[PDB]
Amino acid sequence: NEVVTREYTINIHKRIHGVGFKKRAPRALKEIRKFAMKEMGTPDVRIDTRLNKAVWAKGIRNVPYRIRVRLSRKRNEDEDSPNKLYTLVTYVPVTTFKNLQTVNVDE
Amino acid sequence: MKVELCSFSGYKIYPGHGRRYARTDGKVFQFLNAKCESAFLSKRNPRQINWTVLYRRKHKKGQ
Amino acid sequence: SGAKFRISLGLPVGAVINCADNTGAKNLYIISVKGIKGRLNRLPAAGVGDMVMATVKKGKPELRKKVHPAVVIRQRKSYRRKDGVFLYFEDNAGVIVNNKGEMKGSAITGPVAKECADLWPRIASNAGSIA
Amino acid sequence: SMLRLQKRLASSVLRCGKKKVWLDPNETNEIANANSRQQIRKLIKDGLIIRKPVTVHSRA
Amino acid sequence: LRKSLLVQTKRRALEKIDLKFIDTTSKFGHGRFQTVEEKKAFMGPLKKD
Amino acid sequence: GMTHIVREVDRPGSKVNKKEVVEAVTIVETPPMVVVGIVGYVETPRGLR
RNA sequence: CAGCAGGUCUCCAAGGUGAACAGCCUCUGGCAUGUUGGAACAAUGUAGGUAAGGGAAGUCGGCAAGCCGGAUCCGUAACUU
RNA sequence: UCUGGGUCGGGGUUUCGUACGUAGCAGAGCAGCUCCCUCGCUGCGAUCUAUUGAAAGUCAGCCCUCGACACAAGGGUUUGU
């Protein structure tokens, strides 16, 4: 109920339409963090390295239109952080993008 | 109310839209928008353009 | 009887328009438009069908170096007819005329706009094709 | 911690730029105490530091 | 909307209005069809079937 | 929104007599009202209170 | 007067495109964008661009901007020492 | 609580113009084998046709969704005749 993980797809073109060429990719990582705090209630969001590679795989200017991403709220069992829960966000390689919904996967 | 067929593309041009073009020797051509207008002014044959009706009358497509 | 029904006008003072008649002239240098009251720094422009003051630059020398009245019969700027059609004639053309509306010439090369015909019925007499 | 010293020495021993010097990020704590060459040349034999390959510039 | 304060007595204001055509083409770009049925008949069959 | 009207203009004395035009209009969706009260006003020397 | 877009004498010079040690991209080598970042994209600005029709009618003045531009085959006037 | 809004997906509309792959006896021709057959076979080969009005985008400030996902009376500061 609190350590649940599930699939999501994020349309970048919705969240970057308007910004300049040199700030498209940095804004996208900020929008993934903003998107992760809405569904998952944890304000602390960690973006895994392969997801950062996937957004930057086509340059800072030509950010990919659609991306399929996995959000996983975790336990935070080691750090005595003021936040008891965090979300680990990782990238899922997907070939075809049409007709995929936010399915709830089982860990 | 006279709907009339575009000279380059071949789509029906409703009376409120389109553009009228008449060259010097005396004949008149009809364009639905500037997309079709820009092609005819640069000597582009519609028969080599895929999306026009005359392509479909030449390649026997559709129907 | 016949009104104007204002159109899009795009031929200001200084434009050279070709001669579409048989007076021997080639071009017409627009010097001023007859009927324009004016405005500060606003160049007097003419559409099709307006009596305009022109001057031949190249052509027959007995027509050059003097002032001739003219009526514009073709224009490049797309103007809107009242039924909602946008027309342009791929060139700017005019004819040499006097103050009464009588042509110096006798024949017209190229079409003449429909609104130019009814304000100037004598221009429509020698027009080979209309609109 | 501070591996600026280790990268400068790793460039001189390997005769490379230090662009091709790759320090091990996961097991880092036994790299910082090697504050000289031949303390890191042992780490070359230990596989902690590997010369990165040249970026490919294809002539084909 | 509000009724006019002035007393409208002109041939422009008192002209009877009879419509003849309604232009219901798409305003989301340069449309060319009034309705879907007029479009689909001219569009013919599509790949999405 | 806005759209065209093709209509017949029958004004006398014009050049557009017995010919058609296109005409820009504005579409205003006008839902019916619900009356939920009345108010009264009295004229005063200081205004209309 | 400074970690100042200023000034200061020299050695070596990869690959591609391309006449070229010209301009652009990449390798070796070097760096974090040059006394800071985040949020919006108001006016007026600085630096770039585009404009239907006319083409200097603007202005003291074609100022600025704009046109042509490389190579190959023709062809090339007045004048002249 | 007219249960609502958000996200995705689905269509509608539209922008551009026919995607990769496959197949072809199209394809200027060229090369190999040789049953020296060269309409014989196999390869390279700009491009062409069928799939293919195809592929891609489509609100960030376009329209319906009740198709999936979770969320939604939750927090803080003040206000008295």
Cβ–Cβ contact F14 with C under 8 A? yes
- Rounded to whole angstroms, how far apart are CA atoms B17 and E25? 10
State the structure-solving technique.
cryo-EM
Cβ–Cβ contact B55 with E under 8 A? no
> Distance in angstroms, CA of C54 to C1' of H15?
46
Please return the burial class of B18, using the count of CB atoms within 10 Å of its CB with bins 0-12, 13-18 and 19+: buried
Chain F residues whose CB is inside 8 A of the C82 CB are: 15-16, 21
Residue D41 backbone dihedrals phi, psi, to 5 degrees: -65, -30
Please return the burial class of B30, using the count of CB atoms within 10 Å of its CB with bins 0-12, 13-18 and 19+: buried
Element (H, E) at A38: helix A24-39
E34 touches strand H (CB under 7 A): no
Element (H, E) at E41: helix E36-43
| Residue E39: DSSP 8-state | H
Query: SS3 for chain C, per residue?
Result: CCCCCCCCCCECCCCEEEECCCCCCCEEEEEEECCCCCECCECCCECCCCEEEEEECCCCCCCECCCEEEEEEECCCCEECCCCCEEECCCCEEEEECCCCCECCCCCCCCECHHHHHHCHHHHHCCCCEC
Confirm if F2 and C68 have CB atoms less than 8 A apart.
no
Residue C80 backbone dihedrals phi, psi, to 5 degrees: -105, 120
Indicate the residue of F3, F11, F30 with minimum beta-carbon distance to E24: F3
